[PDB]
Design a protein around this nucleic acid. Structure first.
Lengths: 85, 49, 1111
DNA sequence: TATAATGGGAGCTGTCACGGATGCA
DNA sequence: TGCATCCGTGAGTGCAG
């Protein structure tokens, strides 16, 4: 599924955060913080470790995404080329 | 109208004859792949991709 | 000063609440203030009753509620959050077999709330939900463009709530039916409903023409459920037509009031059209085992009787405003809501029939997110969710009253013909005919007439006074365009005695056509001239002397008026300038009678007669979407005894409560030596002196400190290789000190970032080996100021994480925002305009000694060239000056109602009363006439302006009455060979200032794949040298100059890098190699299995990759 | 790794004009 | 064979975005 392939077990734990965060929200009336997750996620789970788990969970985005309601600019067009000198 | 279509077809034949292209080449076994820089994966400011 | 009003029209009702379309609509969809018991099945509620109950186990819907917001409007504004409410919904699950009862109230997420002025805050950025105009639910008939005598009938529901169906009667006598572009004979359908061949003639029985043609018993030879499978065949080529699935399809297309909704409007429209009541908003029913038609035969009735000749069977004008209607914000957002609820139900039944059929709850059978994202979506990327226009308080109010024919459910640009864009006879009093944009969107985006309101069905309607006998009531009544066409409606200014129609001819319309008619024949009367025009349009004095095509620019440019620090209301007004500040909810008023306790640049507390001490605090120097300081200032002093509804603070562009979009200046109308050319404007340095046309602007500059794989980013004051000079204005953390002066190059925030796998190379390690300073491992990534910007640091927000309150997107430690102010004096390049469509760019600022001046020593402020007037035909600006002359010497302002204002005698009278002040003052102060005033008068007489043989005072009088006065070139003291038009004109500074728009680049960033320079000022763009420019160079034959634009200046990376070394080294530029973008072309054709080959003249390849792709 | 489970689900609508290739009385 | 009829291809520029 993901453009960035992530081991089947990391994928498994990611979905864990999602489903547990969801119940937390269904419980609180607001989305939880990092720490409100690391708690209900149990032991070995701190706020730091929920965070860097979410940022690798992060799916990329299309260079051809539409910028504006016309279609005469691409999100990719506003991206400098840092590599070549 | 038979004379007409025999032209249209013959124009495709003589197209291939005069160039040296093989009709079967309109079929691919090996699909080519475009150099990665012409289709990049990049980190934008926020370390996002 | 004194304010003289003109105009004889007694306007019965006031302008209605000018945001009502936005506030009334939303609250009418939420009902967050109605006790659930007392709610009413429309909007948020109605969506609930639609998607529920979920069906096999069955989950049902009790009620919803709304909580107050987690954070107050400002809080969300600052913290880039959304101003929303929590949505709870109480549900009861029951088991289809046992009697199970569970009941929870499950949190659905947050709905975004609407502020008082009728906008939204979405990720901390005000936005507006533009109403959408579209054709309205109903059934319509329209002639066939092919066959002159036959007519298509069309059946249209609310968008994405049913299919469109056409009933074209083919050239084979028996009638057709289109659905998902599939045609088939109609009779097959009527059969399915239970219809009998006789009950057809029993009901049609008139038109042996086709009543008898429609019948074909190759179909009648079946029962109802027989043809029912007959048809499923016709719409599903491949699906096995089992009688449980064919009932499922048609029902789910024509009778299921769960994906087929005619409007609520659509019911009434086709109801009164076809003359039949209607059980529900649905074509067909399923009642007592089979189908019981509702609409198809009534529709069938009309169409036929039209195609012979019958009475009362008219085609329909689909552009009429009885057949077009408005999807206000509340409706538009509920639609998106009915789409989240829809997805949420797909996912409950999924977990109803898998996971455990008895140990389940409402709680865990609902995943809210599909709802959440549908809302979030409509508000963050819709084409109707727009970044709010709060340039000035009018731009925000005009936005909320805009009307787009575009958008999801409407027209694509290409879809838009003429008829959608034309002004319609029915726009009268509903949609302004002036305020639209010039260009592609002309006639799609429009504005709400000033007196108009949208009814519960979503039609615009406009008020008219009822005239009975010949006397005019005060009873006002709002009509849709349809009932309008019923009456003879006399014009707003038909003359009266008391409340009787004096005139013997009255000027009225019937069905929008203009008719001359006697007062006995008259049934209604316009309420006011203001009722035909936009709000902005109504701000234009002497509108009836302005050609339409520049009233339109006058309307629009207003919304572009920059709030001025010394802003003032126009010396000539229309009588709305006050309401506009009122509803613009930007000015600040008194809630009840009382007295002023304290007063202060920051707050105003008022003791009320109710012993309450209300303390209104002042939004002081707030940055708006467009950067234009939204500043509130106080207009009462301690002790001031204030009645109710009086003013307490002036908004922006408000001066004691009148809309102040610009400044009144002394204007002279004459060529001025070139600096007037082609609409350019000439101004007096005295305007910058007394700080006229000066405005405050702020730009936000954000930065983020993020966790990296190579280290963290640090916000520091410790930036390698940088001199204490380059840091003198930063605190210890690396933030500029509030209250500093920052200009291009200046660091606003120091930031450090770790160096990559380019940790020093040999060339660089060695170079430092000489300097005894070894490789430093961090980098200057600070946030500087971009070219052409700068100002006075006004504020800094520092959001870390690890602090309270705060948590940011994953991987960011801390973010810092620093707002920067600039005072902007007027300058050469800025754009000015007046309400009449006169616009130009300040082209020159003379010192006061060069300005034309009048004999008593006073110098004009503005020199507008007269060549602007004749072809533009906007004479109103001319009147605006004349009456502005008068007002400048009588110290007066005026209120000249549109179409009912100050006429010419009435103003020439004022112009004389001013003459005495201007000149009589003189002949008594020891000075008579002047020698240059006689040379001018000599000339004026040949022209024919003055009566020969009359005293200088007599003759100057005559010129003054003409708006004209004697004028001395300050460069010579000699007079202007003629008498000039000098007067007082309201003139605004537009948002289009050179400062925002001067940009240039030697070289800069480039594009990933193309290696061509980016675009736009903010990227440090390059300028697009497009096809048409290339042509230009081509036509000239500038080969080398073109080649340069195609290689060295864009993407010939070799010769580009090669040039910028040749310049800095003083050597001519290198001849160029191949553009790197052609290569991209080759490789992209290879990737399509196409072998493109560069060939020398003897036909052997040329490697334009210098062997880098060979093996 | 073992009750049994056996054919999907959402269409999207208000442009137009020309040129070519195909079907049909 | 001549003529409906469908499918595919077009539909201005730059700038702000």
């Amino acid at each position: 599924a993901r453009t960035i392939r992530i081991p089947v077990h990391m994928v498994e734990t990611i979905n864990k955060l999602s489903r547990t965060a969801r119940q937390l929200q269904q419980e609180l009336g607001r989305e939880p913080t990092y720490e409100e997750i690391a708690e209900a996620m149990g032991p070995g789970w701190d706020a730091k470790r929920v965070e860097e788990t979410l940022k690798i969970a992060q799916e990329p985005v299309s260079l051809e995404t539409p910028i504006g309601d016309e279609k005469d600019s691409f999100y990719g067009d506003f991206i400098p080329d840092e590599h070549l000198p | 109208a038979r004379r007409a279509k025999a032209r249209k077809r013959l124009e495709v034949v003589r197209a291939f004859l005069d160039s040296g292209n093989r009709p079967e080449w309109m079929i691919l076994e090996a699909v080519p792949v475009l150099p990665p820089d012409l289709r990049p994966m990049v980190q934008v400011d926020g370390g996002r991709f | 000063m004194e304010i003289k009003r003109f105009g004889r029209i007694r306007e019965v009702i006031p302008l209605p609440p000018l945001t009502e379309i936005q506030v009334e609509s939303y609250r009418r969809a939420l009902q967050a203030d109605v006790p659930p018991e007392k709610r009413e099945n429309v909007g948020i509620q109605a969506a609930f009753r639609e998607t529920f109950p979920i069906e096999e186990l069955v989950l049902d819907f009790l009620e919803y509620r709304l909580g107050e917001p987690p954070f107050p409007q400002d809080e969300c504004r600052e913290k880039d959050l959304t101003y929303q409410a929590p949505l709870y919904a109480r549900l009861q699950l029951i088991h289809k077999d046992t009697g199970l009862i569970k009941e929870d109230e499950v949190f659905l997420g947050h709905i975004p709330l609407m502020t008082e002025d009728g906008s939204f805050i979405i990720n901390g950025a005000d936005r507006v939900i533009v109403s959408q105009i579209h054709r309205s639910p109903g059934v319509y008939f329209t002639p066939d463009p092919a066959r002159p005598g036959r007519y298509i009938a069309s059946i249209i529901p609310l968008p994405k709530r049913g299919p469109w169906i056409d009933l074209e009667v083919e050239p084979n006598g028996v009638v057709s039916m289109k659905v998902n572009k599939r045609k088939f004979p109609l009779v097959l359908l009527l059969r399915v409903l239970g219809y009998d061949q006789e009950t057809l003639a029993r009901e049609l029985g008139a038109y042996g023409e086709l009543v008898q043609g429609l019948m074909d018993e190759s179909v009648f030879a079946m029962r109802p459920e027989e043809a029912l499978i007959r048809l499923f065949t016709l719409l599903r080529p491949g699906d096995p037509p089992k009688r449980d699935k064919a009932v499922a399809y048609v029902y789910g297309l024509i009778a299921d009031p769960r994906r087929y909704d005619l409007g609520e409007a659509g019911r009434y429209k086709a109801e009164e059209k076809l003359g039949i009541r209607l059980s529900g908003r649905t074509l067909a029913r399923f009642e007592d085992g089979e189908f019981k038609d509702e609409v198809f035969l009534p529709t069938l009735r009309y169409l036929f009787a039209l195609t012979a000749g019958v009475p009362g069977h008219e085609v329909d004008d689909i552009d009429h405003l009885g057949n077009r209607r408005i999807r206000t914000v509340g409706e538009l957002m509920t639609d998106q809501f009915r789409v989240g609820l829809a997805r949420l139900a797909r996912g409950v039944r999924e977990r109803m029939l898998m996971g455990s059929e008895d140990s389940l709850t409402p709680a865990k059978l609902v995943n809210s997110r599909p709802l959440e994202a549908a809302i979030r979506e409509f508000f963050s990327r819709s084409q109707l969710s727009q970044f709010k226009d709060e340039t000035n308080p009018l731009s925000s109010l005009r936005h909320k009253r805009r009307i787009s024919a575009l958008g999801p459910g409407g027209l694509t640009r290409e879809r838009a013909g003429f008829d959608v864009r034309d002004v319609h006879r029915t726009h009268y009093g509903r949609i302004c005919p002036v305020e639209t944009p010039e260009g592609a969107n002309i006639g799609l985006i429009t504005s709400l007439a000033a007196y108009a309101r949208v009814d519960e069905l979503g039609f615009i309607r406009t008020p008219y006074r009822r005239v009975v006998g010949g006397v005019v009531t005060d009873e006002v009544v709002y009509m849709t365009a349809t009932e309008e066409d019923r009456y003879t409606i006399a014009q707003a200014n038909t003359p009266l005695e008391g409340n009787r129609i004096a005139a013997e001819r009255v000027v009225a319309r019937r069905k929008g056509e203009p008719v001359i008619v006697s007062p006995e024949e008259v049934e209604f009367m316009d309420v006011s001239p203001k009722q035909v025009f936009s709000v902005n349009t109504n701000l234009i004095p002497f509108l009836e002397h302005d050609d339409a095509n520049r009233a339109l620019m006058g309307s629009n440019m207003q919304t572009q008026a920059v709030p001025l620090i010394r802003a003032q209301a126009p010396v000539v007004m229309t009588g709305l300038e006050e309401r506009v500040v009122r509803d613009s909810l930007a000015a600040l008023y008194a809630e009840e009678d009382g007295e002023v306790a304290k007063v202060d640049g920051n707050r105003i507390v008022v003791r009320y007669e109710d012993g309450r001490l209300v303390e209104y605090p002042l939004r002081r120097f707030y940055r708006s979407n467009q950067g234009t300081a939204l500043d509130q200032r106080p207009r009462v002093v301690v002790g001031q005894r204030v009645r109710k509804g009086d003013l307490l603070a002036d908004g922006p562009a408000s001066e004691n409560g009148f809309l102040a979009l610009g400044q009144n200046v002394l204007v002279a109308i004459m060529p001025f030596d070139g600096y007037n050319f082609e609409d350019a404007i000439v101004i007096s340095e005295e305007l910058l002196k007394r700080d006229f046309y000066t405005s405050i602007h702020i730009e936000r500059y954000e930065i983020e400190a993020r966790d990296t794989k190579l280290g963290p980013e640090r916000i520091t004051r410790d930036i390698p290789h940088l001199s204490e000079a380059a840091l003198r204005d930063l605190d210890e953390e690396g933030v500029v000190r509030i209250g500093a002066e920052v200009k291009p190059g200046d660091i606003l925030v120091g930031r450090t970032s770790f160096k990559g796998e380019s940790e020093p190379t040999p060339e660089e390690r060695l170079l430092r080996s000489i300097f005894g300073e070894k490789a430093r491992d961090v980098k200057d990534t600070s946030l500087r100021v971009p070219p052409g910007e700068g100002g006075i640091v006004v504020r800094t927000v520092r959001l870390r994480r690890g602090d309270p309150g705060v948590e940011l997107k994953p991987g960011v430690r801390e973010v810092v925002r620093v707002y920067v102010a600039q005072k902007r004096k007027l300058q050469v390049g800025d754009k000015l305009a007046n309400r009449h469509g006169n616009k130009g760019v300040v082209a020159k600022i003379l010192p006061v000694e060069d300005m034309p001046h009048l004999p008593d020593g006073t110098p004009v402020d503005v020199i507008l060239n007269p060549l602007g007037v004749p072809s533009r035909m906007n004479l109103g600006q001319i009147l605006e000056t004349h009456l502005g002359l008068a007002g400048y010497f009588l110290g007066q302002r005026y209120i000249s109602p549109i179409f009912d204002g100050a006429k010419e005698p009435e103003i020439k009278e004022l112009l004389a009363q001013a003459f005495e002040v201007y000149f009589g003052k003189r002949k008594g102060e020891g000075f008579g006439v002047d020698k240059r005033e006689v040379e001018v008068l000599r000339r004026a007489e040949k022209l024919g302006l003055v009566t020969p043989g009359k005293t200088p005072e007599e003759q100057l009088k005559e010129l003054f009455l003409q708006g004209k006065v004697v004028l001395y070139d300050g460069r010579t003291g000699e007079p202007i060979e003629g008498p000039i038009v000098v007067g007082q004109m309201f003139i605004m500074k537009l948002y289009h200032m050179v400062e925002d728009k001067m940009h240039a680049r030697s070289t800069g960033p480039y594009s990933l794949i193309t290696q061509q320079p980016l675009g736009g000022k903010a990227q440090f763009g390059g300028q697009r040298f497009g096809e048409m420019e290339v042509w230009a160079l081509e036509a000239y034959g500038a080969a080398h100059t073109l080649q340069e634009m195609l290689t060295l200046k864009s993407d010939d990376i070799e010769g580009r890098n090669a040039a910028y070394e040749a310049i800095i080294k003083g050597e001519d530029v290198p001849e160029p190699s191949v553009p790197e973008s052609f290569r991209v072309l080759v490789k992209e054709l290879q990737a399509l299995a196409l072998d493109v080959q560069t060939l020398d003249e003897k036909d052997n390849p040329v490697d334009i990759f210098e062997g880098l792709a060979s093996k």
